[PDB]
mmCIF file of N, CA, C and O and ligand atoms in Angstrom:
data_model
loop_
_atom_site.group_PDB
_atom_site.id
_atom_site.type_symbol
_atom_site.label_atom_id
_atom_site.label_comp_id
_atom_site.label_asym_id
_atom_site.label_seq_id
_atom_site.Cartn_x
_atom_site.Cartn_y
_atom_site.Cartn_z
ATOM 1 N N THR A 1 141.025 103.082 92.376
ATOM 2 C CA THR A 1 141.174 105.134 92.233
ATOM 3 C C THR A 1 140.089 106.184 92.612
ATOM 4 O O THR A 1 139.823 106.304 91.316
ATOM 5 N N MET A 2 139.206 107.023 92.714
ATOM 6 C CA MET A 2 138.915 108.068 92.141
ATOM 7 C C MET A 2 139.663 109.024 91.922
ATOM 8 O O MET A 2 141.160 109.099 92.194
ATOM 9 N N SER A 3 139.053 109.378 90.977
ATOM 10 C CA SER A 3 140.195 110.693 90.534
ATOM 11 C C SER A 3 139.561 112.081 90.730
ATOM 12 O O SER A 3 138.384 112.540 90.606
ATOM 13 N N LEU A 4 140.636 112.312 90.922
ATOM 14 C CA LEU A 4 140.241 114.252 91.345
ATOM 15 C C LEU A 4 140.346 115.484 90.418
ATOM 16 O O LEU A 4 139.659 116.628 90.365
ATOM 17 N N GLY A 5 140.206 114.801 89.090
ATOM 18 C CA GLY A 5 140.547 115.705 88.534
ATOM 19 C C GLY A 5 141.210 115.917 86.990
ATOM 20 O O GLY A 5 142.282 115.704 87.670
ATOM 21 N N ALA A 6 141.144 116.664 86.139
ATOM 22 C CA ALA A 6 142.054 116.751 85.115
ATOM 23 C C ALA A 6 143.171 117.443 85.673
ATOM 24 O O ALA A 6 143.203 119.082 86.435
ATOM 25 N N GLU A 7 144.586 116.989 85.026
ATOM 26 C CA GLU A 7 146.103 117.847 85.407
ATOM 27 C C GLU A 7 145.718 119.095 84.970
ATOM 28 O O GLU A 7 145.338 118.982 83.603
ATOM 29 N N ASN A 8 146.759 120.065 85.175
ATOM 30 C CA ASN A 8 147.204 121.932 84.665
ATOM 31 C C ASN A 8 147.851 122.004 84.852
ATOM 32 O O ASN A 8 148.535 121.962 86.186
ATOM 33 N N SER A 9 148.947 122.509 84.150
ATOM 34 C CA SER A 9 150.122 123.599 84.415
ATOM 35 C C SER A 9 149.844 124.739 83.762
ATOM 36 O O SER A 9 149.871 124.576 82.304
ATOM 37 N N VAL A 10 149.602 126.425 84.403
ATOM 38 C CA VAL A 10 149.364 127.017 84.047
ATOM 39 C C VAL A 10 150.995 127.366 83.976
ATOM 40 O O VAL A 10 151.828 127.705 84.250
ATOM 41 N N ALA A 11 151.000 128.500 82.296
ATOM 42 C CA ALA A 11 152.488 128.498 82.377
ATOM 43 C C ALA A 11 153.081 129.939 82.773
ATOM 44 O O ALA A 11 152.604 130.922 82.006
ATOM 45 N N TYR A 12 153.202 130.060 83.725
ATOM 46 C CA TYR A 12 153.514 131.278 85.079
ATOM 47 C C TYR A 12 154.469 131.807 84.535
ATOM 48 O O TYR A 12 156.045 131.015 84.852
ATOM 49 N N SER A 13 155.412 132.679 84.359
ATOM 50 C CA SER A 13 156.863 133.479 84.343
ATOM 51 C C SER A 13 156.381 134.866 84.714
ATOM 52 O O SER A 13 155.280 135.699 84.893
ATOM 53 N N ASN A 14 157.780 135.692 84.582
ATOM 54 C CA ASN A 14 157.134 137.266 85.776
ATOM 55 C C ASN A 14 157.073 138.109 85.042
ATOM 56 O O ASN A 14 157.283 139.252 85.020
ATOM 57 N N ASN A 15 157.255 137.778 83.064
ATOM 58 C CA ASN A 15 156.079 138.793 82.321
ATOM 59 C C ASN A 15 155.534 138.815 81.517
ATOM 60 O O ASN A 15 155.498 138.922 80.822
ATOM 61 N N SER A 16 154.756 137.779 81.768
ATOM 62 C CA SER A 16 153.203 137.193 80.748
ATOM 63 C C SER A 16 152.070 136.990 81.625
ATOM 64 O O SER A 16 152.117 136.600 82.286
ATOM 65 N N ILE A 17 151.155 137.645 80.281
ATOM 66 C CA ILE A 17 150.075 138.016 80.937
ATOM 67 C C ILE A 17 148.700 136.860 80.128
ATOM 68 O O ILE A 17 149.713 136.561 78.732
ATOM 69 N N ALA A 18 147.833 136.684 80.625
ATOM 70 C CA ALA A 18 146.900 136.205 79.364
ATOM 71 C C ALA A 18 145.479 137.239 79.996
ATOM 72 O O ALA A 18 144.483 137.190 80.572
ATOM 73 N N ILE A 19 144.516 137.740 78.493
ATOM 74 C CA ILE A 19 143.686 138.699 78.898
ATOM 75 C C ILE A 19 143.108 137.955 77.568
ATOM 76 O O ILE A 19 143.297 136.738 76.365
ATOM 77 N N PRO A 20 141.510 137.611 77.369
ATOM 78 C CA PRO A 20 140.587 137.130 76.813
ATOM 79 C C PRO A 20 140.531 138.288 75.698
ATOM 80 O O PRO A 20 140.655 139.109 75.749
ATOM 81 N N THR A 21 140.074 138.064 75.255
ATOM 82 C CA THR A 21 139.562 138.200 73.319
ATOM 83 C C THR A 21 138.509 138.271 73.085
ATOM 84 O O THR A 21 137.651 138.556 72.223
ATOM 85 N N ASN A 22 137.415 137.330 73.823
ATOM 86 C CA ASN A 22 135.796 137.154 73.603
ATOM 87 C C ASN A 22 135.735 136.478 75.012
ATOM 88 O O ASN A 22 136.531 135.919 76.153
ATOM 89 N N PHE A 23 133.788 136.265 74.930
ATOM 90 C CA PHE A 23 133.539 135.622 76.276
ATOM 91 C C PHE A 23 132.143 134.858 75.355
ATOM 92 O O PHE A 23 131.979 134.216 74.869
ATOM 93 N N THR A 24 131.561 134.351 76.758
ATOM 94 C CA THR A 24 130.099 134.105 76.986
ATOM 95 C C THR A 24 129.470 134.227 77.351
ATOM 96 O O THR A 24 129.267 134.470 79.077
ATOM 97 N N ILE A 25 128.247 133.789 77.633
ATOM 98 C CA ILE A 25 127.520 134.699 78.613
ATOM 99 C C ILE A 25 126.491 132.965 78.932
ATOM 100 O O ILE A 25 125.461 132.212 78.412
ATOM 101 N N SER A 26 126.445 132.503 80.095
ATOM 102 C CA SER A 26 126.405 131.567 81.027
ATOM 103 C C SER A 26 124.696 131.547 81.644
ATOM 104 O O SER A 26 124.970 132.396 81.933
ATOM 105 N N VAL A 27 124.166 130.604 81.997
ATOM 106 C CA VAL A 27 122.715 130.264 82.382
ATOM 107 C C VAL A 27 122.546 129.321 83.449
ATOM 108 O O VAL A 27 122.197 128.169 82.865
ATOM 109 N N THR A 28 123.009 129.048 84.182
ATOM 110 C CA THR A 28 123.078 127.944 85.698
ATOM 111 C C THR A 28 121.573 128.076 86.403
ATOM 112 O O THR A 28 120.938 129.312 86.474
ATOM 113 N N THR A 29 121.418 126.624 86.683
ATOM 114 C CA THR A 29 120.454 126.482 87.529
ATOM 115 C C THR A 29 121.111 126.346 89.288
ATOM 116 O O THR A 29 121.432 125.091 88.789
ATOM 117 N N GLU A 30 120.227 126.844 90.151
ATOM 118 C CA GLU A 30 119.883 126.808 91.725
ATOM 119 C C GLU A 30 118.786 126.225 92.035
ATOM 120 O O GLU A 30 118.267 127.271 92.330
ATOM 121 N N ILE A 31 119.075 125.355 92.601
ATOM 122 C CA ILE A 31 117.498 125.082 93.311
ATOM 123 C C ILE A 31 117.738 124.612 94.607
ATOM 124 O O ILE A 31 117.942 124.156 95.876
ATOM 125 N N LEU A 32 116.494 125.317 95.444
ATOM 126 C CA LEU A 32 116.626 124.967 97.138
ATOM 127 C C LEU A 32 115.679 124.990 97.715
ATOM 128 O O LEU A 32 114.551 125.796 97.322
ATOM 129 N N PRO A 33 115.387 124.448 98.778
ATOM 130 C CA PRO A 33 114.406 124.165 99.147
ATOM 131 C C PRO A 33 113.972 124.540 100.186
ATOM 132 O O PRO A 33 114.579 125.920 100.390
ATOM 133 N N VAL A 34 112.810 125.306 100.036
ATOM 134 C CA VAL A 34 111.687 126.718 101.122
ATOM 135 C C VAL A 34 111.370 126.312 102.596
ATOM 136 O O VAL A 34 111.599 126.836 103.662
ATOM 137 N N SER A 35 110.262 125.195 102.134
ATOM 138 C CA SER A 35 109.145 124.997 103.638
ATOM 139 C C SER A 35 109.443 123.175 102.465
ATOM 140 O O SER A 35 108.348 123.627 101.546
ATOM 141 N N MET A 36 109.079 122.981 103.974
ATOM 142 C CA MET A 36 108.099 121.196 103.960
ATOM 143 C C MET A 36 107.337 120.838 104.132
ATOM 144 O O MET A 36 106.169 122.168 104.202
ATOM 145 N N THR A 37 106.578 120.274 103.906
ATOM 146 C CA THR A 37 105.426 119.432 103.991
ATOM 147 C C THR A 37 104.129 119.615 105.382
ATOM 148 O O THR A 37 104.881 119.538 106.388
ATOM 149 N N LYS A 38 103.564 120.853 105.559
ATOM 150 C CA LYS A 38 103.091 121.478 106.621
ATOM 151 C C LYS A 38 101.804 119.703 107.778
ATOM 152 O O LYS A 38 101.617 119.130 106.732
ATOM 153 N N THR A 39 102.503 119.412 108.709
ATOM 154 C CA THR A 39 101.717 117.895 109.377
ATOM 155 C C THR A 39 101.117 118.523 111.002
ATOM 156 O O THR A 39 101.801 119.065 111.167
ATOM 157 N N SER A 40 100.161 117.627 110.999
ATOM 158 C CA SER A 40 99.343 117.511 112.597
ATOM 159 C C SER A 40 99.600 115.696 112.563
ATOM 160 O O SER A 40 98.817 115.718 111.351
ATOM 161 N N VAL A 41 99.082 115.694 114.023
ATOM 162 C CA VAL A 41 99.138 114.305 114.833
ATOM 163 C C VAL A 41 98.028 114.416 115.351
ATOM 164 O O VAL A 41 98.347 115.583 117.118
ATOM 165 N N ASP A 42 96.905 113.865 116.600
ATOM 166 C CA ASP A 42 96.192 113.396 116.804
ATOM 167 C C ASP A 42 96.638 112.382 117.291
ATOM 168 O O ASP A 42 96.993 111.277 117.515
ATOM 169 N N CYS A 43 97.345 112.565 119.080
ATOM 170 C CA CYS A 43 98.040 111.787 120.021
ATOM 171 C C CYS A 43 96.740 110.825 120.070
ATOM 172 O O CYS A 43 97.619 109.916 120.305
ATOM 173 N N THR A 44 96.278 111.143 120.912
ATOM 174 C CA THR A 44 94.658 110.467 121.120
ATOM 175 C C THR A 44 94.257 109.071 119.611
ATOM 176 O O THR A 44 94.057 107.820 120.271
ATOM 177 N N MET A 45 94.347 109.635 118.958
ATOM 178 C CA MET A 45 93.465 109.139 117.844
ATOM 179 C C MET A 45 94.661 107.864 117.544
ATOM 180 O O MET A 45 94.552 106.648 116.861
ATOM 181 N N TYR A 46 95.729 108.368 117.895
ATOM 182 C CA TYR A 46 97.230 108.112 116.968
ATOM 183 C C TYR A 46 97.099 106.243 118.258
ATOM 184 O O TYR A 46 97.250 105.040 117.894
ATOM 185 N N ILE A 47 97.455 107.076 119.701
ATOM 186 C CA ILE A 47 97.614 105.941 120.201
ATOM 187 C C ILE A 47 96.593 105.249 120.777
ATOM 188 O O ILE A 47 97.302 103.813 120.707
ATOM 189 N N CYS A 48 95.432 105.343 120.874
ATOM 190 C CA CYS A 48 93.648 104.646 120.864
ATOM 191 C C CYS A 48 93.086 104.856 120.141
ATOM 192 O O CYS A 48 93.367 105.823 118.888
ATOM 193 N N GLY A 49 92.290 103.598 119.893
ATOM 194 C CA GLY A 49 91.217 103.482 119.116
ATOM 195 C C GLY A 49 90.331 103.944 119.366
ATOM 196 O O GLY A 49 90.578 105.367 120.002
ATOM 197 N N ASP A 50 89.291 103.905 119.214
ATOM 198 C CA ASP A 50 87.888 104.307 119.941
ATOM 199 C C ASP A 50 88.122 103.743 121.412
ATOM 200 O O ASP A 50 86.693 103.169 121.727
ATOM 201 N N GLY B 1 85.342 96.289 118.240
ATOM 202 C CA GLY B 1 85.159 97.745 117.478
ATOM 203 C C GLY B 1 83.690 98.365 117.260
ATOM 204 O O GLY B 1 83.125 97.822 117.895
ATOM 205 N N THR B 2 84.916 99.548 116.581
ATOM 206 C CA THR B 2 83.554 100.534 116.483
ATOM 207 C C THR B 2 84.051 100.731 114.517
ATOM 208 O O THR B 2 84.430 101.540 114.818
ATOM 209 N N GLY B 3 82.295 100.697 113.634
ATOM 210 C CA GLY B 3 82.752 101.564 112.645
ATOM 211 C C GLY B 3 81.729 101.096 111.496
ATOM 212 O O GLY B 3 80.896 101.233 112.116
ATOM 213 N N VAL B 4 81.838 101.427 110.052
ATOM 214 C CA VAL B 4 80.831 101.573 109.474
ATOM 215 C C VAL B 4 80.995 99.829 108.924
ATOM 216 O O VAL B 4 82.288 100.128 107.688
ATOM 217 N N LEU B 5 80.174 99.095 108.577
ATOM 218 C CA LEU B 5 80.165 98.339 107.732
ATOM 219 C C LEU B 5 79.089 98.196 106.398
ATOM 220 O O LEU B 5 78.481 97.605 106.113
ATOM 221 N N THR B 6 80.595 98.354 105.293
ATOM 222 C CA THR B 6 80.161 98.061 104.042
ATOM 223 C C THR B 6 80.098 96.974 103.380
ATOM 224 O O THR B 6 80.979 96.208 103.989
ATOM 225 N N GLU B 7 79.471 96.734 102.239
ATOM 226 C CA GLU B 7 79.193 95.441 101.351
ATOM 227 C C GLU B 7 80.443 95.862 100.297
ATOM 228 O O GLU B 7 81.240 97.317 100.142
ATOM 229 N N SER B 8 81.676 94.564 100.494
ATOM 230 C CA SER B 8 82.338 94.857 99.402
ATOM 231 C C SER B 8 82.997 93.733 99.203
ATOM 232 O O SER B 8 82.066 92.935 98.288
ATOM 233 N N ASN B 9 83.729 94.172 97.343
ATOM 234 C CA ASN B 9 83.883 93.259 96.373
ATOM 235 C C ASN B 9 85.578 92.685 96.943
ATOM 236 O O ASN B 9 86.165 92.062 95.783
ATOM 237 N N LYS B 10 85.180 92.145 97.595
ATOM 238 C CA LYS B 10 87.171 91.810 98.313
ATOM 239 C C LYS B 10 86.689 90.454 98.120
ATOM 240 O O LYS B 10 85.856 89.112 98.418
ATOM 241 N N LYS B 11 87.858 89.355 97.300
ATOM 242 C CA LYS B 11 87.898 87.750 96.961
ATOM 243 C C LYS B 11 88.562 87.144 97.946
ATOM 244 O O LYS B 11 89.887 87.383 98.031
ATOM 245 N N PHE B 12 87.608 86.924 98.681
ATOM 246 C CA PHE B 12 88.386 86.592 100.016
ATOM 247 C C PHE B 12 88.310 84.573 99.407
ATOM 248 O O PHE B 12 88.206 84.377 98.867
ATOM 249 N N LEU B 13 89.750 84.120 100.667
ATOM 250 C CA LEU B 13 89.298 82.776 99.482
ATOM 251 C C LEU B 13 88.742 81.961 100.863
ATOM 252 O O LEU B 13 88.731 82.395 101.624
ATOM 253 N N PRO B 14 88.401 80.152 100.467
ATOM 254 C CA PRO B 14 87.264 79.945 101.555
ATOM 255 C C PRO B 14 87.747 79.453 103.045
ATOM 256 O O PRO B 14 87.689 79.599 103.975
ATOM 257 N N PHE B 15 88.843 79.528 103.193
ATOM 258 C CA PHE B 15 89.699 79.115 104.780
ATOM 259 C C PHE B 15 89.747 80.521 105.090
ATOM 260 O O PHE B 15 90.273 80.745 106.377
ATOM 261 N N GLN B 16 90.151 82.066 104.464
ATOM 262 C CA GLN B 16 89.933 82.951 105.282
ATOM 263 C C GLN B 16 89.102 83.368 105.835
ATOM 264 O O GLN B 16 87.752 83.100 105.613
ATOM 265 N N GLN B 17 88.790 84.199 106.678
ATOM 266 C CA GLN B 17 88.826 84.743 108.013
ATOM 267 C C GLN B 17 88.554 86.197 107.878
ATOM 268 O O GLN B 17 86.846 86.956 107.643
ATOM 269 N N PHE B 18 89.480 86.793 107.794
ATOM 270 C CA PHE B 18 89.744 88.228 108.311
ATOM 271 C C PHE B 18 90.099 88.829 107.475
ATOM 272 O O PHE B 18 91.548 88.246 107.038
ATOM 273 N N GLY B 19 90.789 90.386 107.459
ATOM 274 C CA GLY B 19 91.521 90.843 106.124
ATOM 275 C C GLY B 19 92.199 91.949 106.969
ATOM 276 O O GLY B 19 91.250 92.858 107.519
ATOM 277 N N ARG B 20 93.752 91.646 106.933
ATOM 278 C CA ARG B 20 94.278 92.889 107.312
ATOM 279 C C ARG B 20 94.926 94.142 107.007
ATOM 280 O O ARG B 20 95.134 94.082 105.786
ATOM 281 N N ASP B 21 95.114 95.240 107.758
ATOM 282 C CA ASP B 21 95.659 96.260 107.238
ATOM 283 C C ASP B 21 97.311 96.431 107.216
ATOM 284 O O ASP B 21 97.718 95.357 107.505
ATOM 285 N N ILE B 22 97.296 97.441 106.268
ATOM 286 C CA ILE B 22 98.900 97.478 107.018
ATOM 287 C C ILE B 22 99.601 97.972 107.863
ATOM 288 O O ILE B 22 100.552 97.283 109.097
ATOM 289 N N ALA B 23 98.450 98.448 109.123
ATOM 290 C CA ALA B 23 98.603 98.490 110.457
ATOM 291 C C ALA B 23 98.555 97.296 111.307
ATOM 292 O O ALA B 23 98.645 97.661 112.776
ATOM 293 N N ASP B 24 98.471 96.544 111.065
ATOM 294 C CA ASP B 24 97.844 94.622 111.446
ATOM 295 C C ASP B 24 96.023 95.097 111.778
ATOM 296 O O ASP B 24 95.936 94.795 113.386
ATOM 297 N N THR B 25 95.700 96.174 111.377
ATOM 298 C CA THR B 25 94.478 95.977 111.998
ATOM 299 C C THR B 25 93.476 95.799 111.411
ATOM 300 O O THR B 25 93.636 95.004 109.899
ATOM 301 N N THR B 26 91.906 94.909 111.799
ATOM 302 C CA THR B 26 90.980 94.855 111.164
ATOM 303 C C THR B 26 90.488 95.220 109.457
ATOM 304 O O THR B 26 89.647 96.359 110.218
ATOM 305 N N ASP B 27 90.576 95.347 108.666
ATOM 306 C CA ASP B 27 89.738 95.956 108.018
ATOM 307 C C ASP B 27 88.771 95.681 107.395
ATOM 308 O O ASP B 27 87.316 96.208 106.583
ATOM 309 N N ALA B 28 88.804 94.136 107.091
ATOM 310 C CA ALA B 28 87.477 93.423 106.273
ATOM 311 C C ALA B 28 86.856 92.033 107.070
ATOM 312 O O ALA B 28 87.846 91.278 107.582
ATOM 313 N N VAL B 29 85.797 91.323 107.352
ATOM 314 C CA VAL B 29 84.963 90.291 108.183
ATOM 315 C C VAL B 29 84.230 89.736 107.195
ATOM 316 O O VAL B 29 83.992 90.071 106.414
ATOM 317 N N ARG B 30 84.411 88.390 107.534
ATOM 318 C CA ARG B 30 83.171 87.948 107.102
ATOM 319 C C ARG B 30 82.013 87.623 108.088
ATOM 320 O O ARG B 30 82.474 87.271 109.386
ATOM 321 N N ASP B 31 80.942 87.824 107.233
ATOM 322 C CA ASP B 31 80.184 87.453 108.175
ATOM 323 C C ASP B 31 79.655 85.739 108.619
ATOM 324 O O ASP B 31 80.329 85.010 107.239
ATOM 325 N N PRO B 32 79.604 85.595 109.863
ATOM 326 C CA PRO B 32 79.540 83.363 109.818
ATOM 327 C C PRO B 32 78.327 83.147 109.075
ATOM 328 O O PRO B 32 78.361 81.706 109.594
ATOM 329 N N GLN B 33 77.427 83.971 109.520
ATOM 330 C CA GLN B 33 75.930 83.317 109.405
ATOM 331 C C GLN B 33 75.430 83.129 108.159
ATOM 332 O O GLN B 33 75.430 81.996 107.596
ATOM 333 N N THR B 34 75.797 84.178 107.397
ATOM 334 C CA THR B 34 75.807 84.449 105.599
ATOM 335 C C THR B 34 77.111 84.615 105.537
ATOM 336 O O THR B 34 77.968 85.653 105.846
ATOM 337 N N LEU B 35 77.572 84.041 104.518
ATOM 338 C CA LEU B 35 78.653 84.427 103.174
ATOM 339 C C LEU B 35 78.967 85.065 102.981
ATOM 340 O O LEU B 35 78.596 85.026 101.505
ATOM 341 N N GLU B 36 79.228 86.609 103.501
ATOM 342 C CA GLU B 36 79.571 87.669 102.908
ATOM 343 C C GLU B 36 80.181 88.950 103.880
ATOM 344 O O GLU B 36 80.856 88.201 104.356
ATOM 345 N N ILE B 37 80.972 89.049 102.948
ATOM 346 C CA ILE B 37 82.396 89.700 103.483
ATOM 347 C C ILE B 37 82.681 91.194 103.806
ATOM 348 O O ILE B 37 81.367 91.774 102.456
ATOM 349 N N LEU B 38 83.026 92.394 104.517
ATOM 350 C CA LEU B 38 82.231 93.386 104.635
ATOM 351 C C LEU B 38 83.376 93.345 104.793
ATOM 352 O O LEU B 38 84.262 93.526 105.012
ATOM 353 N N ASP B 39 83.650 95.381 104.960
ATOM 354 C CA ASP B 39 84.328 96.105 104.868
ATOM 355 C C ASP B 39 84.610 97.583 106.310
ATOM 356 O O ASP B 39 83.098 97.755 106.379
ATOM 357 N N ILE B 40 84.660 97.612 107.035
ATOM 358 C CA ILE B 40 85.181 98.533 107.968
ATOM 359 C C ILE B 40 85.796 99.490 108.125
ATOM 360 O O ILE B 40 87.256 99.822 107.603
ATOM 361 N N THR B 41 85.100 100.711 107.550
ATOM 362 C CA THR B 41 85.818 101.670 108.516
ATOM 363 C C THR B 41 85.621 102.662 109.584
ATOM 364 O O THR B 41 84.247 102.633 109.209
ATOM 365 N N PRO B 42 86.015 102.886 109.592
ATOM 366 C CA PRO B 42 86.539 104.409 111.148
ATOM 367 C C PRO B 42 85.292 105.930 110.595
ATOM 368 O O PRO B 42 84.715 105.935 109.865
ATOM 369 N N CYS B 43 84.369 105.594 111.598
ATOM 370 C CA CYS B 43 83.284 106.837 111.102
ATOM 371 C C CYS B 43 84.271 107.771 110.570
ATOM 372 O O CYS B 43 85.585 108.984 111.771
ATOM 373 N N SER B 44 83.112 108.940 110.603
ATOM 374 C CA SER B 44 83.480 110.543 110.333
ATOM 375 C C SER B 44 84.403 111.211 111.610
ATOM 376 O O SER B 44 83.935 111.110 112.800
ATOM 377 N N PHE B 45 85.568 111.666 111.212
ATOM 378 C CA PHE B 45 86.451 112.413 112.167
ATOM 379 C C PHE B 45 87.505 113.029 111.545
ATOM 380 O O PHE B 45 87.549 112.821 110.640
ATOM 381 N N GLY B 46 87.315 114.738 112.236
ATOM 382 C CA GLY B 46 88.121 115.487 111.938
ATOM 383 C C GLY B 46 88.780 116.780 112.375
ATOM 384 O O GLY B 46 87.702 116.855 113.317
ATOM 385 N N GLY B 47 89.609 117.987 112.205
ATOM 386 C CA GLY B 47 90.625 118.298 112.722
ATOM 387 C C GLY B 47 89.261 119.618 113.117
ATOM 388 O O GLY B 47 88.801 119.979 112.691
ATOM 389 N N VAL B 48 88.988 120.435 114.368
ATOM 390 C CA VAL B 48 88.400 121.537 114.571
ATOM 391 C C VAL B 48 89.363 122.482 115.300
ATOM 392 O O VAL B 48 90.209 122.348 115.909
ATOM 393 N N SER B 49 89.177 123.538 114.722
ATOM 394 C CA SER B 49 90.071 125.353 114.603
ATOM 395 C C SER B 49 88.759 126.119 115.214
ATOM 396 O O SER B 49 87.913 126.118 114.496
ATOM 397 N N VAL B 50 90.088 126.826 116.097
ATOM 398 C CA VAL B 50 88.200 128.415 116.832
ATOM 399 C C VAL B 50 89.497 129.308 116.261
ATOM 400 O O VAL B 50 90.241 129.395 116.445
HETATM 401 C C1 LIG C 101 133.281 134.862 70.104
HETATM 402 O O1 LIG C 101 132.469 133.506 70.196
HETATM 403 C C2 LIG C 101 131.207 133.625 69.469
HETATM 404 C C3 LIG C 101 130.336 132.269 69.951
HETATM 405 O O2 LIG C 101 129.593 131.941 71.345
HETATM 406 C C4 LIG C 101 131.580 133.752 68.197
HETATM 407 O O3 LIG C 101 130.006 133.870 67.366
HETATM 408 C C5 LIG C 101 129.715 132.529 66.276
HETATM 409 O O4 LIG C 101 130.621 133.330 65.154
HETATM 410 C C6 LIG C 101 130.726 131.949 64.409
HETATM 411 C C7 LIG C 101 131.881 132.576 63.195
HETATM 412 O O5 LIG C 101 131.370 133.980 62.297
HETATM 413 C C8 LIG C 101 129.810 132.333 63.662
HETATM 414 O O6 LIG C 101 129.837 130.768 62.790
HETATM 415 C C9 LIG C 101 128.906 131.838 64.705
HETATM 416 O O7 LIG C 101 127.693 131.384 64.042
HETATM 417 C C10 LIG C 101 128.532 132.369 65.913
HETATM 418 N N1 LIG C 101 127.642 132.318 66.523
HETATM 419 C C11 LIG C 101 126.940 132.824 67.851
HETATM 420 C C12 LIG C 101 126.097 132.274 68.883
HETATM 421 O O8 LIG C 101 126.303 133.624 66.908
HETATM 422 C C13 LIG C 101 132.521 135.272 67.653
HETATM 423 O O9 LIG C 101 132.106 134.934 66.128
HETATM 424 C C14 LIG C 101 133.476 135.068 68.552
HETATM 425 N N2 LIG C 101 134.015 136.803 68.599
HETATM 426 C C15 LIG C 101 135.361 136.625 68.221
HETATM 427 C C16 LIG C 101 136.009 138.428 67.862
HETATM 428 O O10 LIG C 101 136.175 135.759 68.406
HETATM 429 C C1 NAG C 102 162.454 136.541 85.753
HETATM 430 O O1 NAG C 102 162.368 135.323 84.743
HETATM 431 C C2 NAG C 102 163.869 134.673 83.623
HETATM 432 C C3 NAG C 102 162.703 133.989 83.494
HETATM 433 O O2 NAG C 102 162.143 132.667 83.975
HETATM 434 C C4 NAG C 102 165.019 134.082 85.555
HETATM 435 O O3 NAG C 102 165.666 134.617 84.098
HETATM 436 C C5 NAG C 102 164.650 135.722 85.844
HETATM 437 O O4 NAG C 102 166.308 135.333 86.446
HETATM 438 C C6 NAG C 102 163.876 136.126 86.446
HETATM 439 N N1 NAG C 102 163.430 137.647 87.113
HETATM 440 C C7 NAG C 102 164.394 137.583 88.067
HETATM 441 C C8 NAG C 102 164.319 139.246 89.420
HETATM 442 O O5 NAG C 102 164.433 136.535 89.196
#
């Protein structure tokens, strides 16, 4: 059976907060297609020969 | 057919007569009079734009 990820429990209460003391700078990569290859078809030359 | 008959370096087996392409068209022929192998190439053609 497939796994949906690691289980976690946020320690929530009505007077407690969490504040970061340090950070990190991430660089991610996102790849997007823009334009496929242009094609043309000669219909007479395809369907019939000479 | 119609095309250009060029001298070929195809190695036909002695029982073979024709050599076919991917589209099951005749790509190579065996000359019946003298035992030589020829390749068939379609003549020059291309798109025209105005
Ligand atoms: C915040 O985190 C950075 C890591 O991204 C810490 O930088 C490292 O600090 C250690 C301890 O001096 C060094 O050995 C490493 O070479 C540091 N890494 C880099 C990339 O510089 C930084 O010290 C942390 N700051 C606080 C206040 O915790
Ligand atoms: C706040 O949390 C504490 C412990 O979780 C609880 O005893 C208290 O009743 C909560 N306050 C209210 C107003 O419910």
